[PDB]
Every structure is written in C-alpha cells, then in structure tokens.
Symmetry: C5
Subunit: 243 residues, 5 copies
Amino acid sequence: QTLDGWYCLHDFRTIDWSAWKTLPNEEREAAISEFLALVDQWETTESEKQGSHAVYTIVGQKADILFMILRPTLDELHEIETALNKTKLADYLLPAYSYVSVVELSNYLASGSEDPYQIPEVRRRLYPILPKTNYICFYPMDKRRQGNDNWYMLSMEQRRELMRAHGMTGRKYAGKVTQIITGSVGLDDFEWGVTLFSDDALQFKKLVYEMRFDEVSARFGEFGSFFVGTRLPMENVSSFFHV
Amino acid sequence: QTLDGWYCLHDFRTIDWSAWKTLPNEEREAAISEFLALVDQWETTESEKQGSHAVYTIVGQKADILFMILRPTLDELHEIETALNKTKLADYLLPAYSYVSVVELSNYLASGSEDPYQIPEVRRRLYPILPKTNYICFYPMDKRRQGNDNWYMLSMEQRRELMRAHGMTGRKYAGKVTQIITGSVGLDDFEWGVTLFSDDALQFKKLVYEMRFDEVSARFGEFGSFFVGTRLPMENVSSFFHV
Amino acid sequence: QTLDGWYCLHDFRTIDWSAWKTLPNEEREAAISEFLALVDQWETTESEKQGSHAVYTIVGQKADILFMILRPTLDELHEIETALNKTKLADYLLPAYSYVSVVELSNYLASGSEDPYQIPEVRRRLYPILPKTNYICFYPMDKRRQGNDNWYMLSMEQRRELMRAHGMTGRKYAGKVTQIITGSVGLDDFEWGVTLFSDDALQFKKLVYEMRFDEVSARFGEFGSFFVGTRLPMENVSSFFHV
Amino acid sequence: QTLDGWYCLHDFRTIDWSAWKTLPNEEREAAISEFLALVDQWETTESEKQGSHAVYTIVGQKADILFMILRPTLDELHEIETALNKTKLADYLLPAYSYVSVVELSNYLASGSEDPYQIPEVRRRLYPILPKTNYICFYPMDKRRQGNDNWYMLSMEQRRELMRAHGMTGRKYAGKVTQIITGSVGLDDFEWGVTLFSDDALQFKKLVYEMRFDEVSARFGEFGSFFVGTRLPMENVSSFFHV
Amino acid sequence: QTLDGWYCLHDFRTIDWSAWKTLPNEEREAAISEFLALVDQWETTESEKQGSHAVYTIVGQKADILFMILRPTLDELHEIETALNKTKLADYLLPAYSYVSVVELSNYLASGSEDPYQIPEVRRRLYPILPKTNYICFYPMDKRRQGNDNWYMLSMEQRRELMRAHGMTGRKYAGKVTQIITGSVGLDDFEWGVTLFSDDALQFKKLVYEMRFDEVSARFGEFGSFFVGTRLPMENVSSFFHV
Ligand SMILES: [Mg+2]
Ligand SMILES: [Mg+2]
Ligand SMILES: [Mg+2]
Ligand SMILES: [Mg+2]
Ligand SMILES: [Mg+2]
C-alpha cells in the first residue's frame, strides 16, 4: 500500500573535543574547510533535487551532531557515510547512533489512472527537501505485538480506524510541526523513523504528548530514544569547532 | 493543560582521575580557574533571573558530578554544554548520563482573566531558582502502558483521582523536600524528570518509598536510574579536584 | 526434521578510520594486499565447492563490513576467523557483532529411498554458493515463548498451518529475494539467522513488512538487529580502504 | 515503619593488571603502602564505632575487589570514595559496579516508651560492625510490580503474611549466614541491597535457592547481579598486588 | 535436595591481537612458555584428582578462548584467576564473559545408610574430570517466574513430572553429549550453568532444540548467551598464538 521515496540516513556523532584540541591550529582549519567542501557537494545535490540533508547540533550526551541525509539509492548513502568518515574532522566525530530507513507514504489520492511516482503533489513528499527549521527531533518506533495489544493481528479496518484519531491529532499542528516518516522494517532495528521539524521545540513535546493519548499510540506505540537539536548553519561551523 | 517554563539540562560526568593526575600542576590549576570563570557566568545569569544552575557531586560509579542547568531556550542549553566542553577540565569529565526536559506545571488556579505566564506565583515555579540544599536526587520516569496498567487509556477522571493520592503524599513532605518536575515527552527517553532537593538525604528514600504505595506509582510508575549527590559550591571546587 | 549443511559465521566489524589513517601508506597498501590474498584463498575454496563466502559493506554505525563464511566444520570457521584476525588490516577492524549458525533445511521431498545429503537439488541448498547480489540484509530471530503466544507449546499441526501462510508470503518474492536460513539453537543467542539477498534493497522492507502480517510473524516473531549492506567485490577493496 | 542506620557504599573495581605491571616497582610499593595507610584510617573509624568496612576479592569478571563502606553520612561516603580515587592504586582499580543505600530495620520491638535509636539492641543493628567471614555475597533486589504480581498493591496484611514465610526460611540459617539489608529506594537503581556474610560460600546458594520457593520471592522477587568473594586480609594486600 | 561438588569458573577472554603483535618475539615466546607452565600445574592437579580444567577456542566475537576450571573451594578459583591474570599472556586476554557456579547433583540413589559424598559413583559426578571432546557449548539459564509460567509456584510433584520429560529427552543423547550442570543461585546472575561436551557440534543444536519442545523448557526456560568452541590442545597453543 505504501509508496517508497528516498533512502534516509541519520548519522549521529559525539565530538572528541580533547583530541581535537591537540591537533595543531593549521590542521584544524584545514579540517573545517575540508568538511565545508563536502557539505557544499551536498548542497549542490539538494539544489539539483537529487537528495537533501539537514545538520543539527544535538543537546545532551546521546550525541553532539546529526547529519540527516536523503539520497536515491542505498549505495549513495553508503558513499556519503564513507566520504564523511574519510575527512579529517570525522576522526573527531565518534559514533553515537545511526538509523537507516526509506521515506514512505501511505496517504495519497489513488485514482489508478496515473503513475503516482510522476505526480508532482506526491513526488514532493517522496523526495522531500528537508525543512531548515530552528529545531529537530528524531525517534524511532515499533507498533506493539504484545498480548492483546498486537497491531499486526488487528483487522485492516481496525487499523484504519485507529489511525484516524492519529491523523486528527496531527491536523492540530498544521503549520507548527512537519513530520518526515521513514520506514525501516527490514532495514534497521525498529519499524519507523519519525523526524519532526519545528521553529518551536515545545511543539515536539506538545505533539508527542497529545498523540500518546490516542489509542493507537497509548496501546500500540513502542518508542526508542529521542534526540533533539538546534540547526547548525554552515556559517556557524567554524565558530562551533573553534578551539 | 500544562504550562511550560525553562528548558533543563542534567549533565552527569565521570572524572578521569588518572589522566587528570598526568596533567602538569600549573595546567590543572589553570583549568580549575577557567572552569570557575565559566560557572561565575552562570551565577551572574541566575542573579539576573535569566536562568538557574546546580552543581552536585554524585556518590557511586554512575557519575561523579552533575551540572543541572535551566535556561529560556534549548539553544542556550546547547551553548552552555558547548562552552563547558571546550574547557580544559571538561576533557577529564567523561560522559555518564544526561537528560533534556522542560519545567512543566499542571496545578495552578486558572481564572481565564489573566495571562498565567505573567502571574508572579506561577512565574516563580516556571522559572525557578534551584534550591541550594545539602543534597540532590534525580530520576526519570514514564507512566506505564502495559496490559491492564495503561495510564494513557484511563479516563481523565480516573487519572485525576489517581493523582490526588500522589499529591497528598507530597504534602506530607512540605518543608522537607522540594521537587522540580520537568517534562521530556518528545525531548528525551522517558516522559518526566524528577529532581528532589533536601537537606536530609534520607528524605529522598522516605518520600519515594511512601509514594510507591500510592496506586498511581505502584501500578503506573516506571523508573529509570536514581542519582544522589552532595552540593559542590564553587568554593569547594579547588579542593575537590586537587591532586 | 531438519537437514543440516555448512556451518556459517557472520562476522561484522567497524573500521577504525582514525588509526588506519596514522598507519604509513606503504603499510596500509601491504595490509590491503595481505587481506586480498586471504580472500583469494576463500575464493579458491569456494570454486572447489568446499565452502562459500560473501563480503558486504554495511550502512550505518552498527557495522562497516560483514564477512559471511560457510564451511564444512566449526573448526574451519575458527581457522578462518583466526587467520583474518592475524592480518594487519584486522587490527583496524573492531568488533561489532557476530553470529554462529548452521544452514538448515526443513523443505524437501522426503521419500525415504535416497540419502538426501546426496541428492543434487538438496545439496545445492545445504552447501550453497552465496548470491552475488547488490545488497544483503541480516537479522536473527527467535520464536516467541510468552504467555499465550508460545510457539513451542503449540501442536505440530498448528505450527504447520502457521508456517504455510509464511511460505505463501515468500512465494510472492520468487526471483526478487533469496533467503538463507541458518539454525542457531544451541550455537548462538537467538534461534535462527536470516540472510536475504537482493538486487533491490527495497525488497527487504517489502518482504519483511509483508511477513509481519502473517500470524506466525505477528504473534511469534522476535527479531534482533537488522544489518543492510552493499556488495564489496575484491576489486573495490583497495578503493574502499584507501585514505 | 523502618528505622534508618548508617549509609552504605558498595564499590566494586576491576584490576588493570597490564598497566599496573608497567608501573615501576618502587612506585607500586609506594602505592600499596598509600592504600594500606588509607585502610588504616578506615580501621580507626571502625574501632571507634563510627563506621565499618569490608574488603573482599570478587571471583569472575564482574569485578576483582569490593570495598563495602558504612558511614553516618552521605557526605562521608563521598569523601571516602574521593580519597580512594585520589590514591595511585585507584588508577588501576577501574569501575565495575557500585551501590548506594542505607541500613534499614523493619523488625524490632516497638514499645513507644523509648527512642529506639538509643536502645543497645537496636543500635547494634543500625550501626553494624561488618562480619569478617571468609566469604561475601552481594545482590540488589526490587519487589515486583507487574500484572497480578504487584507487591505495592497488596494489603499490609497480605504483605505481612508473605514476609512471615520469608522470615521462617531465614531462621533456618541462624549461625550460618548473616544478612545486612540496606534500602535504596530513592537512592539507587533497585529497592534493596542484600549483603550476605558466611564462612561457607555454599550457604549463599542454599539460602538464596530455598528463599526462592517462598511465595514472596517466587512471585515478587526481582534480582540484579550477584557478586561473590573471599575476604582479603590487609596482611595479604601486598602479596595480592605483587607483580 | 541437591549435593554440591567442585566450584566452577568459566573464564572467557578476547584476544588483543593488535597489542600482542607489537610485543617482541622473544617476549611472546616467553609468555607462551609461562602459560604452558601454568596449565601444566593445572594438569598435575587434575591428575591428583584435586580439580579439573578445559581449554577451548570460542567461535565468534563473544569470546576467543574459554578456561573452564573446577576446584574444591571458591578460594582456589580466586587463586587460579589471579595467577592467570599475573601471566604476561593474560595482559592480551581481555574480558569477555565469566560464570561462577558449583557442580550440583539432584539425581542419585539415596539410601540413608551411606555418606553419598564418599560413594564412588556419586563422587565421580561431584568431582568430574572434564571430557576431552572436540567441541564445547556453554549457556546459563533461569527457570521462569512470570505470570502463569512460574516454576517456583508449582507443586513439587508438578515440577517432578515436568523434569521427567526433560530427562527422557536427554536419554536420547546418551553417548553423544555429556552435560555438566552447575548451580549458581546466589553465586552469579542466572540460576544454572549448562556446559555440553560432544565430538559433534551439531548434537548441541539437536539436543537444545529438541529440549525446547519439552514443556519444562518451552514454558519455564530462560536462556542467556550461547558460546561454542573447539578444543585447544596444549600442543597447538604455540601455533595458535603465533604471529
Ligand atoms: Mg568512527
Ligand atoms: Mg567529552
Ligand atoms: Mg579484534
Ligand atoms: Mg576511575
Ligand atoms: Mg584483564
């Protein structure tokens, strides 16, 4: 039933400040310039509408930095990761957490008379340009399969009706939050990735809390870790890494 | 229903004593001055009513030191964490645990006729100056969503009755313990943070054990790790880190 | 009931790029040659039909490279592992995950009249030459033993009818995905290893999602981590490891 | 209902033998003497009945050495832990596990007519001199709160009845084992620490197994890790650390 | 009911091949001689009937090598571990897993008229010479205590009738597999250790899978990690560690 879009990598890293500070100044500046040159490649790709990327600083110890990358193939995600790891800066960007998934759409008007992969209204959700909002939030999730709270043993109808209320709660946040749903069954450790974008970080809390009182989330939601962060403008990269 | 206040970062670190002891004395002393100068900034900010902080040493191996930081924005939490990590001392303050949340209030008298964010008796709770008590305790919590113990599937009335008892247990500790509840749904791994402040650390055990016999806690509480600590005022920092 | 074929090791590693970069160029190049010489022995084994192997790069941080090795004995698995670990490159290939299992068949026409280990259509499944597809997916699984969802408490009849739906789902993916099932009860921490091979990675998500709606998976599936990757032919090894 | 006694730290460490062996011999000897000098302080404290301590070597890889420390305040535990960490030997005593708790008594003859914190028969239990038995066992515990097995939702009277059999099983081991119960609700990750002391390590297994058939343990016990050790007389410290 | 025999340490290590390769050749040779001289002491002890041991290489990343040691006291396990760790080789044998337990016998013909500890046929099993088989398999287990599957809430007769089936599955592997059961209630993290010895590793998978269909295992079995290895003859040690 779902339409699949761009592959997605969330690549979180922790900064080894102690090691970075021992690198001579000239090698640090070179490393920053090298990394900025890489991101410039990403920006050209995003300008050509052949992928997208978001770079946020993450608050707390689960990570310091998120690179969220959308590309048309799994190979390209691998290529990006590898290029990143071969930069000098990446030596100081230790592993923290990662997620591999694919942009997934279930909600669209299906007529049968068109290839939806060629319809503009659909493509712009399949192949999204990521929002450049002040804040981001990521978490992965499963649908529960435990006792009488087993999502996958429900009827289609029952699932549809449960998902109605979920949609209704989302509608309350129109123009306040945007959500990128990626599917990861068969690709990583949970079933979906949820990435929220907002200019107001409080809306992540309002929205995710309000959702939790809908039956689909209360009885069927299993959630992983939540990562929240602030946009890192590429103009601020040098000062962020300045020591 | 809740009013949201300052953002909160609990940053817990373990001290790499062995490495620290290798750093030349003059450089340890310079690192301590550099750290004190940073906390001195935090103190000015608190004095200005533009945030608050608490610094405690933590007993046992889960951590050695806690920095608890309240600020108006998530950006300022990022800035503080980054500033801290760029200090020399922070090289020896290894990751242990962290929590990101926002001061949250549900109980206030709501009339309609005023903006509660401008009422003094509400503002002083949203934007608290943290207690300077001998001891602190932190733990995170969820409300349970399992089987027949699913908080989010209850009625509003059933939750309100359950929370009654909880409120009444708390009243018993008026003047003995203060509790700062932060909400982290959508922001970190559990649903709430709970920070307790008392001049008698036994009060933490008394209070949390007593609460556990209230139905809300017994049936619906899910608890993370508990961290307990002793105040580390800045005048004691030099002696604590001295080797 | 099951026929057992070649033992299997899945050996996943993460690359210590920082340390590798410090190794002088001439020694990195000699390490890559040594490693290729090793894989060339594996290829000789496989062309003699005395085992098989695959080498994939893995996307994300759970691992960077997978060596999947099939051999006639557990000893040979130990000798391969040991010989890999004594290469120079392996010093930079840090532990990430591993799995030990044996190729297991339940599906064959059993007539009584032949030794199935001698039948060519059985042998080619016990002792498989692994697919050289663009992509791979690995996950382990258990059959659930919880409450009223206890696979092992069912009747033989109930298990058979359960597994018939599961086989029907698999049939939909004929010629799009091939699946190697290894058994690991008594050998590793889960009960089966599942390795999927496809030239379209989306087919992993499609297949594994679709299966999750079969009662057998919905009620009785317990899954470990999912690792996805892209093929690493030996001709691409020098470029992949180049710095 | 409970009376509270001394605070308790269990500090488990693993020995970094490889590093220890690199340290110059005259520095190892000084480090041993420095450590013994610390323990001499602990011994003066214990002689004055203002704390107690136990030092055991722990079998297996969960730890190598346990320092169990009882002191009148939480601050004193922090001071002891900090002094220990500032010794040279502690550089080689890596983190393994720790537990923070308070000696707790439930069972005592309550007259109302006296302050039981001043009664000799109670004081010797609140403020125990730890036994110098050949062996020790430590484990933490919670009382279950799951489904129909919820300790905290029982009546007082149901709890009292359950604890009766538990008391009866203990009475069987009079003279053979002694048990220090410490409460950690609000202080660490489980609800109680259990420390058993015996001259016969088999009695740990006999006792803990027999307890497990009591309904209170079978239905409501949840156990952490178990750590068993042999007494390290201070006269054997130099030989133990000799390399 | 149970008779206890020798104490048992399972000590698993991972080899630090990178570090070992940097040690000069002469120091490696000396370290191998030193280790071989240690195991010669163990061989003498076994020959005097005062203990037993087994040394196996473990396949996969959970470990590389297992030393399984039986001695009459826990103190002797401590001594052996300490002596091992003080060898040069052990600096390169990093922590992986460990288990501390005691050989435990429930099944024996009890007359009343003899001290069973003095009976040949019982002593043979309390104080066993470990099998010198081609392969070994280790895992720990608990008996479940969850909901309606609570082993310790059954009657003695219910347990008896459940264990009967278990015994009958084992009898099917007479002469194929031998099993050393050690009890660890009160001593380590699970309730029993299960060590299996066979000259055909496939028999581990057959036996353990067949058991899982017995009600006692299906409903009451909780398993830890499974480690499988190949015998390491002392004559092969030099080759194995040769770099
Ligand atoms: Mg890295
Ligand atoms: Mg750091
Ligand atoms: Mg290695
Ligand atoms: Mg330390
Ligand atoms: Mg070691």
